[PDB]
Amino acid sequence: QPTFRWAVVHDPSIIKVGNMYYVFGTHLQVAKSKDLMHWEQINTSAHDKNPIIPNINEELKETLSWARTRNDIWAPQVIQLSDGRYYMYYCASTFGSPRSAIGIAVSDDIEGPYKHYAVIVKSGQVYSVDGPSEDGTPYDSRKHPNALDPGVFYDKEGNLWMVYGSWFGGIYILKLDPNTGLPLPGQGYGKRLVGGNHSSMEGPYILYSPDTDYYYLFLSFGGLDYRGGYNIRVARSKNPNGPYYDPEGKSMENCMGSKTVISNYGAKLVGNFILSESNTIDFKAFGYVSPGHNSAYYDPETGKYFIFFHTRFPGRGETYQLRVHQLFLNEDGWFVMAPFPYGGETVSKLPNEEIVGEYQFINHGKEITDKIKQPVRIKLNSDGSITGAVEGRWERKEHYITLKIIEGNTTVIYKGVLLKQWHYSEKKWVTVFTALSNQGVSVWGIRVE
Ligand SMILES: [Ca+2]
């Protein structure tokens, strides 16, 4: 019964306005929805006649001039501040460069037109012409962030923050004045949360959970392209400005260096996969390549959580869509992602008869890889045993599942949730599980019915 119509929105940032969900993305790709499943595209590029920011080159002359670019802005996020106006935080840049700026535009109406408000953070200063970086020292792209990818959020106390960054100096957070949206004076680039020295991370987003009273920091590791191994990582903190820690207890301030090294940190939520045993490219089969650059939302009306992200697809190169999935909290207060896109599903306790059976099983691992992971077959048996491709034991308590799986010479415990979801490709309701270990590895199970 559920149906879908996606949008084409790269780097999507969610905002709810009235009964309508909007996503704002790179190139001023904008779309909206009442149900999270059918999306109406309202803008597709930052051309001179777009209605979101008309005549953008003149309107945002300050940031675009800085970035030496035209007809484009990257990773915009709109947030409603206390005056009721809509503030679009965005960045201007060029591919591969740290010559970037974070700006703010403002509108009275969600769909615009937005006008210039402020220029707030700059990177890529060339000392002989521009002078120092924001911290008063010469810009050094190993230490200083790239002024990209703003993630703005209120904390539980009403303070306003912006987490930001992409590669280069890492991921930083600035405290903002709730009344103006501007960074409070005297912070330079702010506090470093993750990364440094050109570590492959970007798109930071922070979400508060009332259900656990933690803040969750979402990052994308790797490259966004087909061969980049883009993957979504999660850490959490009792404080909006950290330190953030992963499920193993590692501090994300220590996450920096090579791809192999940074891969050791964070809960990896999803990487590349396809639900085909046949082949790694199978256009009938559900699968993603380079899912990332996400935002997230908590809906107080229902208590559900959602992740908004773009992704590419097996065998389809750089083509991408918006996708929306539900997130759940496991018994340890960590997020686990629903295998399939959101079709209206609400978790509840399943009886045993709906749990027992053969599953396709995907282990997403811990690495940053472009490998398209495929499933193996396992069975969850009535006696609590796991058999097939892996051995172990499973148990459940309400909708919380625990899987204890033998991996080499050790048992790894995965904790997650069980529910019924809409099988996106098979078009039927099926049992699924999604679970996470303390080493930050996600597993998905999709019941063969
Ligand atoms: Ca973002």
Curated annotation (Swiss-Prot):
Optimum pH is 6.0. It retains more than 75% activity over a pH range from 4 to 7. Binds 1 Ca(2+) ion per subunit. Ca(2+) binds at H293. It catalyses: Endohydrolysis of (1->5)-alpha-arabinofuranosidic linkages in (1->5)-arabinans. Keywords: Calcium, Carbohydrate metabolism, Glycosidase, Hydrolase, Metal-binding, Secreted, Signal. Optimum temperature is 73 degrees Celsius. It is fully heat-stable (up to 10 hours) and retains activity at temperatures up to 90 degrees Celsius. The enzyme loses its activity only after 90 minutes when incubated at 95 degrees Celsius. Pfam families: GH43_C, Glyco_hydro_43. GO terms for cellular component: extracellular region. Pathway: Glycan metabolism; L-arabinan degradation. Its cofactor is Ca(2+). This is Extracellular endo-alpha-(1->5)-L-arabinanase. It comes from Thermotoga petrophila (strain ATCC BAA-488 / DSM 13995 / JCM 10881 / RKU-1).
